[PDB]
Design brief:
Chain lengths: 300, 301
Amino acid sequence: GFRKMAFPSGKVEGCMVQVTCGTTTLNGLWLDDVVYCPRHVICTSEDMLNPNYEDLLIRKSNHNFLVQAGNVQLRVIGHSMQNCVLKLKVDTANPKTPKYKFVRIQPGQTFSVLACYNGSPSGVYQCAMRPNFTIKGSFLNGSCGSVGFNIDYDCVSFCYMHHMELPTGVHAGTDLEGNFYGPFVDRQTAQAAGTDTTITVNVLAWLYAAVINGDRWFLNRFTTTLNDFNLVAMKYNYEPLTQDHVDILGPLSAQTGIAVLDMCASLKELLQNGMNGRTILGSALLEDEFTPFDVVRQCS
Amino acid sequence: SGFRKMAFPSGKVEGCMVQVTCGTTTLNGLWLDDVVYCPRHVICTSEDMLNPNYEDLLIRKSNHNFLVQAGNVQLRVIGHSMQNCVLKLKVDTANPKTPKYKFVRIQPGQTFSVLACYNGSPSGVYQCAMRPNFTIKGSFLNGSCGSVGFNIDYDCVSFCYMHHMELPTGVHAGTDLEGNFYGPFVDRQTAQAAGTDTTITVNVLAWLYAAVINGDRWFLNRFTTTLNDFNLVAMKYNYEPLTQDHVDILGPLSAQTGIAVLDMCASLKELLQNGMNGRTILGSALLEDEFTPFDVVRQCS
Ligand SMILES: CCCCCn1cc2cc(Nc3cc(=O)n(Cc4ncn(C)n4)c(=O)n3Cc3cc(F)c(F)cc3F)c(Cl)cc2n1
Ligand SMILES: CCCCCn1cc2cc(Nc3cc(=O)n(Cc4ncn(C)n4)c(=O)n3Cc3cc(F)c(F)cc3F)c(Cl)cc2n1
């Protein structure tokens, strides 16, 4: 009925390059005449534990950076660091640059990842930002600098640049302005992700999806306030809803004629009483990685 | 390192998608060199769709009845022919974005990436498997007809699927790029059922190996089984036979994890007989069968 679908990756494939400093190598993003990549590339192995990035960078010049589009070198003509990203100005404007923007997403929002190795795209999949600001991605060694994105009409919104894998196997990274999602830093030390929670807004979208498809046994004749719902949800390790979350459920609410706070009351009964041997959309688990926009993308 | 359904990057296929229109009937086509491939269903009017005689319908068309649009550019059609359920429209301009490619017919259990398109415009990409009953469990809406499935090796696109229709059960049926259906289906708007489906055993075993590689091992045991005794239980539960070639293909994953293939079989046997008891594997409550051994090797190594 529903599966993770990625955006077509072509517009992003044409922007992927490789960046190397010494033997340190990773992926970068070539837009107009700038290449963006994790500043970790300037680290030697001995720097990686506890880098002084200001110190490392002032010892670099343009001629120390090898940027390659496949095997074609792009000459670097300027360099700077913005938070945890390196910005290399190159002498060639990428002719495959799409219309684009840089956005910072919230937990629960989904995006497509183009996993790349040595500047070469390998695979594309959808994933969600967890409430603890990690992603349950699929990434091997060499994936650093792979990007996440959404496409809205002809415009690519880049939201994620991959930096590191955490001890538990989840992934951490930054926006394209180099600000980390979550309390992580770009050093090769063990950092733990905070306890994760269930993405309530996406579970509600999934219940709407089930209603659209005629599976609606869980609808009740009760309602709740948002505040009371939020207080109860927290006791089952569910995220509180924001005003923005209520608003993004508006289209599904309209399509089904089920008020958001009535769906909240339905979810509240499921939390308190369980599924009691029943399934929703053929599954005993509530899915939390499909957004309201994903549901309308796939149903309509 | 993680485990997700992962598609091939779609860009090489995106640059080949076009819109084809015949009268008011419209769908997607695939532009390679100077030929556009699309479902022959596009030659049908509404009334034709229910019970078409395609040789008759085609003889009654000429080149100028076909409108091919690549974005807003119209490609002039200078020839037409039909190969089984695929129409081939020769156009007067070569597609410069044509990748290295081949046409391949896949076997049940093999996986591929789908590029879902609408009105010639790519919409989404995801991974599917050819089911044992020759359906696919896709994600397709009205207007997806002509979307293609493919695999990429190095720089060469192997096209294996052209989407035609959705069955009443909500699964999907289509052809290879020589226009032959997968399965007992026909390109007519009439209700069609598939054969009873079965589970792709070698793929379930591949996925259990992925689970072990990613640290989820609760289901392992030390029952031992023979291939033959595993196959008897598999058959009983509507699972496809596991062959010695399948065992061979799982060898690299067995070596990596230290778990013999027949020991993984013993684990699967117990899962079938006992269930998962509300536990999950790689976050799934069900035994996943749409990852091949090659898929697992590629994503885990
Ligand atoms: C040809 C042979 C290597 C050429 C020489 N060399 C070695 C290197 C090692 C590196 N390190 C990492 C690469 C990498 O892909 N991933 C991601 C990933 N995600 C799933 N996994 C398993 N790993 C990753 O976590 N790291 C660690 C890491 C990255 C960060 F940015 C950071 F702030 C903190 C860190 F601890 C990097 Cl960035 C470059 C390299 N060059
Ligand atoms: C633009 C404004 C005027 C549009 C005028 N118009 C109407 C049309 C209807 C059509 N039909 C279908 C389109 C379609 O996308 N899918 C796929 C899909 N997959 C998930 N779903 C739900 N449907 C699909 O099953 N069909 C049915 C079908 C297709 C076959 F090839 C076939 F042999 C037998 C069939 F019954 C077609 Cl092909 C062209 C059309 N043009």
